[PDB]
Design brief:
- This protein is an alpha+beta fold.
- The chain has two domains: about 110 residues, Phosphorylase Kinase, domain 1 (2-Layer Sandwich), CATH 3.30.200.20; about 160 residues, Orthogonal Bundle (Transferase(Phosphotransferase), domain 1), CATH 1.10.510.10.
- The chain has nine helices and eight strands.
- The protein has a six-stranded mixed sheet. Strands 7-8 form a two-stranded antiparallel ribbon.
- The radius of gyration is 20 Å and the shape is globular.
- Bound molecules: the ligand Cn1ccc([C@H]2C[C@H](N(c3cc(F)c(NC(=O)c4ccnn(-c5ccc(F)cn5)c4=O)cc3F)c3nccn4nccc34)C2)n1.
- The ligand Cn1ccc([C@H]2C[C@H](N(c3cc(F)c(NC(=O)c4ccnn(-c5ccc(F)cn5)c4=O)cc3F)c3nccn4nccc34)C2)n1 binds next to strand 2 and strand 4.
- This is Hepatocyte growth factor receptor.
Amino acid sequence: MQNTVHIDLSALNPELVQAVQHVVIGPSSLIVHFNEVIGRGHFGCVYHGTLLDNDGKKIHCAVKSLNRITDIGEVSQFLTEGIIMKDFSHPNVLSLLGICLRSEGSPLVVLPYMKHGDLRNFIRNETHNPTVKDLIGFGLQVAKGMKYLASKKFVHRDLAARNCMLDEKFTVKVADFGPVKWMALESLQTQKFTTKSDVWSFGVLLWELMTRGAPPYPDVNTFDITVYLLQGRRLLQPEYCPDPLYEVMLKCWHPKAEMRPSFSELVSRISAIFSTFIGEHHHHH
Ligand SMILES: Cn1ccc([C@H]2C[C@H](N(c3cc(F)c(NC(=O)c4ccnn(-c5ccc(F)cn5)c4=O)cc3F)c3nccn4nccc34)C2)n1
């Protein structure tokens, strides 16, 4: 039976199994709402979950599972993915709550629940219609999360609005659901990624925010993005986007990687722009 698979934890890489052992969740503290699916694919599924804290109070979570398991390699990759987040501790970066290892079945990767889902779908929703200032604030939040990750020498490689999520307090968490329109020029040419190519992707993400989730380069199938960028062309300034914020976008797309601002510089510059735009806003950024 597929629900009787038993994983030999001693087959896993020693550093991986040490990391998993520090984040174990006892099954008695977790209710997986197997009938409440957040998202499903061929290989995995994410469910609503309830964690019971040490007072018996409820923590809403999301619980990742593998579907059918046939080899230890699938399990190792699944756990390695979860453990990426283990040492992330920042308000603007998605964290790992832990890993639940029942006797049988898939290991379960437990994450804090993000009430408002991914940032791109959130800002595209016509009944959310976020204000200019709140969109700037979301960008500032992403910049703060990326400043933290860059300080840990973590290169994201797929920063985009679709990979950020928004929780109940409207805190943005940089994440990766697991991308040529977001890639730096040098990454398109060499397939090498750095923090400076994350800065390029952040520029595109800011553009996504200020267009309320318009697809960048919508005609991409009709031209070559490398040629476009080599000839100096860039995404055009969104309507209602403040001029200094568009200049920030342009700096992120400098053809010379070393000339792009650091994420520390971006936090300072966007915080200045946020502070002087006096408009309606709702969220704590
Ligand atoms: C076809 N389909 C569409 C959707 C899905 C499922 C649901 C979706 N889902 C989700 C998002 C993630 F983003 C993750 N993330 C990771 O598993 C992860 C692994 C390793 N490293 N990072 C990371 C973190 C920070 C960083 F800088 C770089 N990487 C990760 O984020 C897991 C999820 F289940 C959630 N949907 C709604 C609400 N919530 N609430 C918590 C999680 C989610 C996925 N399927």
